[PDB]
Symmetry: C3
């Protein structure tokens, strides 16, 4: 697979895609398996983290920016190497256990698309196995 | 799936859970497949790294702390954003190949639960496919 | 699974192994599934990132080095804790969707072995499921 389109709206942004993943699980009919969530963009990634406090996602974005700023020792002419770095640090995919037809997530644990070079028209892939 | 309970004992800690994963493999009877190890906590994660030198795990913890300290530019009122960041950096899960009924790990390569907000009663999930 | 041998040539290096993964897919005959790429070395890892601009891979290596330098607050007697840290940050494995017998990768998105303690004789494992 299911491809979802996402429109990102800031240069960096966490977008909670947990329900997009649940919908793919529900469509699949799979009761027990794995959900794989993959980002095909080299300046974005996927992570799993706190999903009910905006201050946590702000703290992550702000502090990743502090450590790998937009301006620095970067040769890359497009000027988005900071985004490439942060993308690799978050990861290109994550996976979640499906048990009893539900994503086996912890308390206030959600699945995020992590944009580091928005605003852009983005895709995310969800495969249920 | 197998849920294991872990009691962590320091604010940050690497706990070698390789044998908990081997036990799940052995229980499953699977000779060839994958072991998926998932952390349902947003202030802890899973990584794979050196498992026979305490100085390496100390170096990792200490240097992750140096870069993302407990005190800093953090809005989050609980005061554990450092842990949320480090958790995303390690990852919410890892996976290991099962070959000939054994985890296909390299020399002195082990699977760790990475606590960043202990001491706490924690869980880790192991799914064998 | 397929084990590939790689000879790395610098202390840090990104090696594009995308075609090694495609060959494993092609050998498997699998049309739809997953490719899992695993690094058995604790001082190297796997990441997915830009594969057509050398400046991006240079920016990543250089800036990871800047943040976690070779010399610092490290007890580990071999002197490669920087590599252990960076390895955990990239990850021990990545996975890619196989669709229509092809790796489902984005534009200029490639799979890299990330060496942090070369030059060495290394292995990478590719499992197709
Ligand atoms: Na990471």
């Amino acid at each position: 697979v299911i491809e979802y389109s996402l429109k990102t709206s800031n240069d960096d942004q966490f977008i909670d895609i947990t329900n997009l993943v649940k919908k793919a699980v529900d469509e699949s009919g799979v009761s027990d398996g794995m959900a794989v969530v993959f980002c095909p963009h080299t300046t974005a990634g996927i992570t799993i983290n706190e999903n009910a406090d905006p201050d946590v996602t702000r703290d992550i974005l702000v502090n990743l920016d502090k450590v790998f700023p937009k301006v620095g020792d970067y040769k890359h002419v497009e000027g988005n190497s900071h985004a490439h770095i942060k993308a690799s640090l978050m990861g290109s995919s994550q996976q979640i256990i499906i048990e009893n037809g539900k994503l086996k997530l912890g308390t206030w644990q959600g699945i995020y698309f992590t944009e580091f070079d928005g605003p852009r028209d983005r895709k995310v892939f969800v495969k249920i196995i």
